[PDB]
Design a protein around this ligand. Sequence first.
Ligand SMILES: Nc1ncnc2c1ncn2[C@@H]1O[C@H](COP(=O)(O)OP(=O)(O)O)[C@@H](O)[C@H]1O
Ligand SMILES: Nc1ncnc2c1ncn2[C@@H]1O[C@H](COP(=O)(O)OP(=O)(O)O)[C@@H](O)[C@H]1O
Lengths: 578, 579
Amino acid sequence: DMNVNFDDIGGLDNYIDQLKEMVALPLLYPELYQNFNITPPRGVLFHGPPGTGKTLMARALAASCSSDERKITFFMRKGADILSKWVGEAERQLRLLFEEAKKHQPSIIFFDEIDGLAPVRSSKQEQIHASIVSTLLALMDGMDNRGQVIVIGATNRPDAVDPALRRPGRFDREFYFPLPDVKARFKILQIQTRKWSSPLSTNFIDKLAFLTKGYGGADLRSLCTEAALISIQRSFPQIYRSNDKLLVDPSKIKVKVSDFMLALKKIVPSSARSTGSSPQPLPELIKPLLADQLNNLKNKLDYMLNIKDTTFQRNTSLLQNFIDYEEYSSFRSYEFFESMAESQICKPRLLINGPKGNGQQYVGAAILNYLEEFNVQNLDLASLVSESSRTIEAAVVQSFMEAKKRQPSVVFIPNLDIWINTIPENVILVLSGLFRSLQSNEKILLLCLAENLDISEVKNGILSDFAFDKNIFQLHKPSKENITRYFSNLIELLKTKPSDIPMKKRRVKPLPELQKVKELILTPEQIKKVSACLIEHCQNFTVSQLEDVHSSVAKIIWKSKSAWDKTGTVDEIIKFLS
Amino acid sequence: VDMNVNFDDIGGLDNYIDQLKEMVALPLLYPELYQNFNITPPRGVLFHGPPGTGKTLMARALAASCSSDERKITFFMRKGADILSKWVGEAERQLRLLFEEAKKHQPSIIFFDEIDGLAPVRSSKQEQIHASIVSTLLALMDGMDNRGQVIVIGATNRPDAVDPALRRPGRFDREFYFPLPDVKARFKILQIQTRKWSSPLSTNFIDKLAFLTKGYGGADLRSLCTEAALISIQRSFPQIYRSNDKLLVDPSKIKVKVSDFMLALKKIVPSSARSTGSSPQPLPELIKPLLADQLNNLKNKLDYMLNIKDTTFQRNTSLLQNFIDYEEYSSFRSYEFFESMAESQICKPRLLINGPKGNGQQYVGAAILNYLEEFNVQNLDLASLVSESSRTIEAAVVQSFMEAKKRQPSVVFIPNLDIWINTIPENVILVLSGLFRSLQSNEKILLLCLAENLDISEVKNGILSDFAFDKNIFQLHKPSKENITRYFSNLIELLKTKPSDIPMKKRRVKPLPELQKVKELILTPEQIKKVSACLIEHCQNFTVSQLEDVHSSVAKIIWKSKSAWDKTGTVDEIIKFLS
Ligand SMILES: Nc1ncnc2c1ncn2[C@@H]1O[C@H](COP(=O)(O)OP(=O)(O)O)[C@@H](O)[C@H]1O
Ligand SMILES: Nc1ncnc2c1ncn2[C@@H]1O[C@H](COP(=O)(O)OP(=O)(O)O)[C@@H](O)[C@H]1O
């Protein structure tokens, strides 16, 4: 518990406004609930992925509603911390909790990890957990008409809470705390790196927000902490050898770009610990080879999914939309314009077909990194047959159901050429019947990537019932300008100096103790000959063959990283490409 | 179980010692640096690795080493799910009282040994009795109130059996892989266990023990030194094993020789041999003439494939010693460009070793896996896939590849590929090929397959065409004349020995003291040349298995007459056998 105000939470302004409403307006403006015979909303259920800001929202509601002109007291009970081996002493300890929260009315109650305290309806296990959920229903249903007991509940899996506790009288509003996008991760990184003695450039924070996809709110905090710790390790290492306190001085500890870029390589986000990785953007080496034809593949995805407009809820908040904008013949016209706004999506399908090894694993990852607000459901082989209990049928059906719950979704099938051979025809037809039983306005994009997929399989074959009619994009091999830029990026390492490479040198003097209180020869005929042989050898090559040539020439270049006579390196590059 | 074991007792984990000092000791001494950036220290590490690696030792040494000053650190320790009872109550209540007493004595370390039994994965049935414990653990570790300076350490064999909500910042933000130690760390562990001893061993003997103990963990090295000391006690004073009264011995002249360690290495089966995959070990000294000419070439090929001897970037063994001994030195064009051009040397590391039937592939695979010491070997052989009877083939292949995807220097190892592509189902090869083509180029997952008489038509237009075995096919050719000459020259060196050189043990002339209770060898050099010529001419165009058959068949004849001084009968029997 700290003095966390609401200006230490980034990206959740709408739920901040709704909580400020339900904690201020039924006690500051009481009259407005009489002319409409309505009760104020009583219960709210916070749910979402871990490290998003649920407990931060409860702590900020505790801190902000504690001031001079009004007192609001906070009662917290953790997950199943109220039960004991005594039979009905848990019922006593819950009833007395609501009694002290009732004889007070500054009280608001919070149940962290409600899915362990109040699980689903008990088919077996008629023990004290069912009595706990029955007394919780019977105790928070009503003992006050229009009272002051807001019961906040935090969980990770909201489907594990009892459905009898998810109703319009108890846990009314259900809030989803989403993993932040780029604009919100920018604000979280400014909230963390705010009171530092030397702040960061905003272009660098934009690059950090671009790099940290899949990072929660806690993982950005961990990245900032690890960058500060690497800066303390880099500035004053001598405090890692003494067992007694030394005298170091702050304001020489500045957090550079290298500390963040080294802290990024060791922090895995919580959405990639049991997955291994996250969909990363297109890497900087092969960006000359594929970003000429990824941008087109972005534009089609900007044309069949309506991403760049986002005509519903484009701004930060709904109340801010009522402040800075003016509203507008509302009965037929609203239905008509909402129908024509939602009718811009027919059936989002995309099959990205190319030759073998033409960078499909980069294009799929770059597209899944580009689609920020989408619930990606992977139908690859390593996610379907990973479990030894569920069948391929049940896995495909459950993944499509999770794609149907969270409505902007991407069903993602990489290596469709393998997927139409490993997966039997029954599961492909089950997925086809699931995709034909959807409305047209449903935002479930079926994305597919394949290598050497014959069009006879998608126009009259097994995939002919997925409607890949005009939505087949063709990754073709990179052209001569792309290969020229790729190998100019390669050749610029042959031109760099042996003193310009970042070879770390040993310090000639030891570290200070603390108080215990020549131009290389490269004639431009050789560079043009290396350019011409690298262009002529990689004629009609795919991306994997170009990376093979790039690695094979970069080994020869990195062997002579200290030499100045670069003639033998050029001759070995000539000799390899023959 | 919280002894005086500190940080000089652990050997070979010098990188995690710096981070555990960074998150336990250094916040206590320097709170002004952590409050300068408004950062909390990282609190809570999940130790994971093979069993017998040093997790509990690291926890106890963290509890005892940072408490040498007058800033005491209490060490609460919990065995793996010993906290739950037959009722619903005490399982959450005891964790409540544990975290409250850890809150009270504020610098504290809670150590959950074997946390995979306390916080298991949410299964299909039997939800309640573990989810009600996971819920109170998650709500107590990173709750709304400040937990204080409670450093939570968990320890496990595999981290996937822990719940993923625990593997999250604020609770288990750091995950430390404790590796089976390399030869320098095994040297340091052997130096640590043989440090208190009265007659210490030499340096080169500990070096030879560090080479001989490949695959051993730390606990196996401790058991080796314990069994060597016990065999030394059995060798010096046997009579204490027969009396029931305490005899008077002196704890001198009981020094551990080499012959005690050489028996302890036979009494100890390591955790590498208990596994079902191919145990990495060097080429044995018999067949090292036959194969080390064409193993070295493979090493050279791997040195051009994985950049082992070219390590200027990604040399992170210890970042703090890197910041101590070295020195720093626009921003993108000096770091990111050169890191990309150093990572862009690994394109697609594959290697298919293909020789005739019986040409020593079971030795070449283990020797390559011994050479790749800093790699993570994941065996995709048949026995490791079918050994876990609950898993399927597909799930085991996907699990091994996903374990190889993390800890990125890794080797996916398929021995007996000719058996593998004939007995694994056809969809599993496509699953593995889709997992390999869904990798980036710069990922160091080497695919190492060894095969016996595999057709090139199967890797050209077959079911292994989607693995890119184009240039990376190495042919183990049959061993040449000089290798066979050196092999049988060692055999001949066995033949021309004297029976006084052949080690026969003793029969002692006097019994042990009770304790106070409280000819010339006739073998002409022409016969040696005849036997060597017959061994060479008989083993024409043979493999390693046929050469070992001939070697065993001749070694039996030589060890028949190991006491005879007239070696003409055994030469006649050797020449009679090879006809
Ligand atoms: N939306 C956010 N904005 C800023 N910081 C956040 C946000 N979400 C989480 N954090 C950081 O994460 C920590 C709290 O997250 P946590 O309470 O662990 O969420 P949850 O309970 O959902 O896992 C705080 O230290 C805070 O700095
Ligand atoms: N890295 C190491 N350095 C020194 N000794 C070790 C190391 N690893 C293990 N040991 C020895 O092995 C013994 C048992 O280790 P243990 O705590 O059982 O590890 P784990 O819990 O991982 O099996 C310890 O008493 C220790 O002396």
